[PDB]
RNA sequence: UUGAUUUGGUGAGAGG
C-alpha cells in the first residue's frame, strides 16, 4: 500500500514542472537533479538509458 | 465553521501546513495535514503479551 | 559529556571509480547528519572543471544536423557532457578537435595543450560514416563548482554569442552519484547507535576517498571560525 | 543474571539459524515462513512489510 | 480534556460515580491531605446537625482491570462550590469532564 | 553468506533431496570429525554445507564415494594393525 | 535439605513499588512484637 | 576555491528564553546544510542540568500523599522534572527547599548555594494549605545529555545509594525548539550569498552563542574522522 | 542426589 503510492507519485508526469524538456545524460544525473533542487520528480525529459 | 474558526486563529484555511523533514531539512512537496487528534492508549500493552 | 569517535572500517573498492565507505559507530541520529551534510556538499559545492561551451561548424542551433555522422548534435552534446577533463594551471581553456576518415572519433583524438589532459581517452565522442566528412568543434572549458544546467545558463546569459556556439550542462563537481544508508551497529551495552554506509561513484580525475576528504575539509574550513 | 558476555554468545547462536514465524489463523502454507533473526531492542516482532 | 468533544463528557463523568460530586453547596476548609472539608451555606443546611461535609478521597488503589483508580481535588482552599458541582477528579477526568 | 539456495537446487534438482544431502554433510561437519571443502566466513554448518553444494563438489554420489573410501581405510587399518 | 522455597516471590518480568501490605493473618502473626 | 567564512554578526535577545541569532556570510547552497546540521545537533546533544533524585522527609514511595499540600507526590515530581537549573562549577549539587505556612511554594524559595542559579522564580511546586504543615525536600541535580530514564538508571547507578530516594526521570536537553531560515544576504558586492537566521528556544539556562559554539565543535570533531583517516 | 502445582471443568468478558 505505501510503496505503490510512492511509485505512483514518482513515475508520473505533469505538463509543467522544474526542468521541463531538458536533456539528461543518464539516470544518475536525473537523481542528482532531483536531489540538488533543479528539477522535479515528475517533469518530462529526454534521458539516455541503456 | 471549521474554516471560519481556522481563520480566527492565524492558521491556513485548508487545514494543511507545509512541513519540512527532520532528516533532510527539505520541504515535503504537496502540503500535509497537521492537527490535534485525541488519541487513547488501550490496555493491550506489549509487555503483557510478550 | 564525551562523544563516540568512529573508525573507518572499510573501503570496499568495487572498481577504480567506485567505493563503499562502511563506517561505524556514531551517536544516535548522527549518521544522517554526516551523510546529508556530505551529500549536499558533494552534489552542489565541490569544485572542478568540465566543458561548458562548444562552437561547431555546419550547425546554427541545437536542432540542426551535420553530415557524415550516425548520431546527431544532441548526441554529440550529450557525449561531450560525459567527457571528464581536468585543467591544472588556468581556468578558461579552449580546445579544438578535427577528425576525418572512416572510424569513430574518441577522446584521444583531440588536440591538447600542456596544461590539460584527458582522464579517459577511449571515451567515445561520435562516429563518422564518410571518409570525406571533416568534423570540427571548438571546445571551451571553464571551471566552476557543482552543477549548472544549460536551461538556467541560457536564462542567465544575455550577450549575443555568435551563431554556432552550443551550451551544455557544466558537470563541474567530479562525483556522479552519492547515496548512503544508515544501518544499526552495536557497542556492547547500547544498541541505539548507528553505522554509516556511504556509496560513491565518480568519473575520472579523482579517487572517491579524495572526494570525501575534500568535502569534509571544505565543511571543516567553513566551520573553522567559531569553534573552541 | 544476564551478564555482559552472553549477548555476544547470543549473536553467535542467532547468526545463520532460521525461525518459523506463524500468524495465529494459518489458512494456507504461506502463513508459516522462516526468517533469520535480527535482534531488537524492544518487545515486538519486527516483520518485513511485503511478507 | 478532549479538545474536540461532544459535550456529553460532563454527564458521563458525573453520572458514573468516579468523581466526588458535592452533596451540599457552600465554601471549603480544605484540610484535603486526607479529606475535602466543605462548609455548607445556610440555606442548604439543616437547623440541627450544624454540619460540614467531609469527602473521602480514594487514593491509589486497584481497579478490576489492574488500572489505577485515583481521585485528586480540583478545588482550591476557600472557593465557592454549588450543589451538584464536582470536587475531586477521578480516573480519566479533567475538571469534571471525561479525559480517556 | 546466504539468502537463497537456488543454485544448490539447480545442482541437486529435487529440492527435497537438497535438505537430505546438506544434512548428511552438516552432520559430517558438526559432530563430525570432518573439515569443510570451502573457506568459511564464520558461517554455520548449514550454510557451509549449502555453500559446498552450490559450487558443485558435494552431492549424494561424492558422499557415498567418501564413505566407501573411509570404509576401505578402516578395513586396511584393521588388517594392517592386526595382521 | 528437605526444607523448600514456596515464599511468594515477584513474577517474571514485572517491577514496581510495594504500595500497601495487608495482613488479617492467622491470629498470631507478629514476628517480634509488631502486631 | 573562492569560498568564504561566516561569523556571528548580530545576536538579538527577544526575551530571556526565546532568542534568535544570525550567521553571515554563508556560501551558495550551504545555508540549508549548516541549518539542518546545527538543528539536529542542537536538538540532540546539548548539555543541561536537571533534577535526578528527590528526597522528601517522611515519604516512603512516590504514590503516597502528604500532610498540608495540594499537589500529590507524583504531581510534585512532575513539577520538579520541569525545573530549570544552571550550575557553574560543579557537575553534581544538592539543593534544599524548606518552607512552612499557607501559600504556594515557588521555586524562589529554595535556599540556593553560590554556584547554582534558579532561573525561574515563578515555577510553582506545591500549594501548602495547612499552617502547621511543613515540607523539606533535598533535590539532587546532575548534568548530562539526551534522555536517561528511571528504568535504565535502576541498575546503572553504581554508587550504592540508600533506600528512600525517589528517582525522577532526567530530561537533560535544555533546547526545546529551533528553526533556521535562509534569507537573502545584503552583501554590497555579492548577490549570491545568504544568511542563516537560527531561532532558538531554550530552557533559559543555556547561552545561545555558547550552544552554537559547542554544536560547531561537535560537528567539527565528528568530521575529523573523515578528514584525517581517509 | 540440589525444588514444586495449574491444566481438569464451568461461566462471563475481551483481541486478531
From Swiss-Prot, chain F:
Keywords: DNA-directed RNA polymerase, Nucleotidyltransferase, Transcription, Transferase
Xref: SMART domains: RNA_pol_Rpb6
Keyword Glycoprotein: no
EC primary class: transferase
Enzymatic reactions: RNA(n) + a ribonucleoside 5'-triphosphate = RNA(n+1) + diphosphate
InterPro entries, per the entry: DNA-dir_RNA_pol_omega, Pol_omega/Rpo6/RPB6, RPB6/omega-like_sf
Enzyme Commission (EC) number: 2.7.7.6
CC per GO annotation: DNA-directed RNA polymerase complex
Biological processes annotated in GO: DNA-templated transcription
GO MF annotation terms: DNA binding; DNA-directed RNA polymerase activity
Membrane-traversing stretches: none
Subunit comment: The RNAP catalytic core consists of 2 alpha, 1 beta, 1 beta' and 1 omega subunit. When a sigma factor is associated with the core the holoenzyme is formed, which can initiate transcription.
Family, as annotated: Belongs to the RNA polymerase subunit omega family.
HAMAP family found in the cross-reference section: RNApol_bact_RpoZ
UniProt function note: Promotes RNA polymerase assembly. Latches the N- and C-terminal regions of the beta' subunit thereby facilitating its interaction with the beta and alpha subunits.
Protein name: DNA-directed RNA polymerase subunit omega
Upper taxonomic lineage: Bacteria, Pseudomonadati, Pseudomonadota, Gammaproteobacteria, Enterobacterales
Swiss-Prot record, chain G:
Source organism, top-level taxon: Bacteria
Role: DNA-dependent RNA polymerase catalyzes the transcription of DNA into RNA using the four ribonucleoside triphosphates as substrates.
Summary of subunit composition and partner proteins: The RNAP catalytic core consists of 2 alpha, 1 beta, 1 beta' and 1 omega subunit. When a sigma factor is associated with the core the holoenzyme is formed, which can initiate transcription.
Family: Belongs to the RNA polymerase beta chain family.
Protein name: DNA-directed RNA polymerase subunit beta
The species this protein was found in: Escherichia coli O157:H7
Residue range from the parent sequence: 911 to 945 of 1342
